[PDB]
Ligand binder design. Sequence first.
Ligand SMILES: [Mn+2]
Ligand SMILES: [Mn+2]
Lengths: 198, 199
Amino acid sequence: AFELPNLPYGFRALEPHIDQQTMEIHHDKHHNTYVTKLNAAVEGTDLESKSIEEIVANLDSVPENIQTAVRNNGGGHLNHSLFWELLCPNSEEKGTVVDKIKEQWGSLDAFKEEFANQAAARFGSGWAWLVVNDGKLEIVTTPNQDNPLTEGKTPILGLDVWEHAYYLKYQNKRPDYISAFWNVVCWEKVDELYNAAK
Amino acid sequence: MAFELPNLPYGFRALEPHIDQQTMEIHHDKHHNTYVTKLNAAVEGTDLESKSIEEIVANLDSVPENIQTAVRNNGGGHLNHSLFWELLCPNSEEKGTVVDKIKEQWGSLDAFKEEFANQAAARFGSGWAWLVVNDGKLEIVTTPNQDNPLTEGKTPILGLDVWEHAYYLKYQNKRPDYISAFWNVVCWEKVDELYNAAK
Ligand SMILES: [Mn+2]
Ligand SMILES: [Mn+2]
């Protein structure tokens, strides 16, 4: 069924913004676990065939006794599958969604300022997102491994703010992590996800 | 006076090699400090400005519903870690009232640890694992984020912070290794003190 996807550029491609140690453990351990437990949950169910997008959209209809496992692990798999593809070494701060973000916030810096505040504000483990919601842009956060897909909002950019993704380098300084993040945001893809959005 | 982040009962390097010295410094001076601050800010000239944190956290729904979320999160923060520092101990000794009463319910300390470890490991995202007194009965629960068993009317006599910030520097992804090490620095002299005062 579900497979851990290969990192597009290896572990050192986001230096010095995200450390090379964190990338290997995040990918090889944290994500790997999500995939193993997810496969264990759906192995032998009607879910086994279907895509993680379809499943995370439909958590409410996932059978009782595996709903938690799928939410947590299905989400972990989707969330991190997007993250890897959304981090770029040759990030160019331009394209469709950036045009569309300047059209909605006035400037990219006024967007970042909100995103950063919502990212910093999410108490405990969670993600910060920019989502396409009924054609409009919205900045929402989720706790743990929850994904706005579950609430009919297509995510086009996400940031893991679990401490396991920033603590080796930035320790308690989550802001520095969010600031740094921008340097490796892969807008070529953030676009790709806006186009396919429904 | 309100609230002030308390000194560790020991040095930062006093729990080595079980909890790293870098983590003991940041965890207390930053993480627990920020809580005290953001908390003090939220209670700036209020009904609970001069109330005990044990009272506030156990009566959380009756906190003005416009600062409720900040107090629950930073209030829990202050109490949880305040407990955690006192419940840690260079020279723990596995005996006393709670150890005898654990033996009485679980059959053995090792059976108790196994459940605590499983429940501690199982807690998804950030939170705490607790041994609490629930109406005289002993019970192992976990709570998300900075929530405390007091809010549900159970007194905590032992707590383990399983936020990734409390173990990632040394143990990284391997939370179970951290839970295992914890047992070497649990302060059963304090666990008793807290149980005794369940009264
Ligand atoms: Mn993660
Ligand atoms: Mn903590």
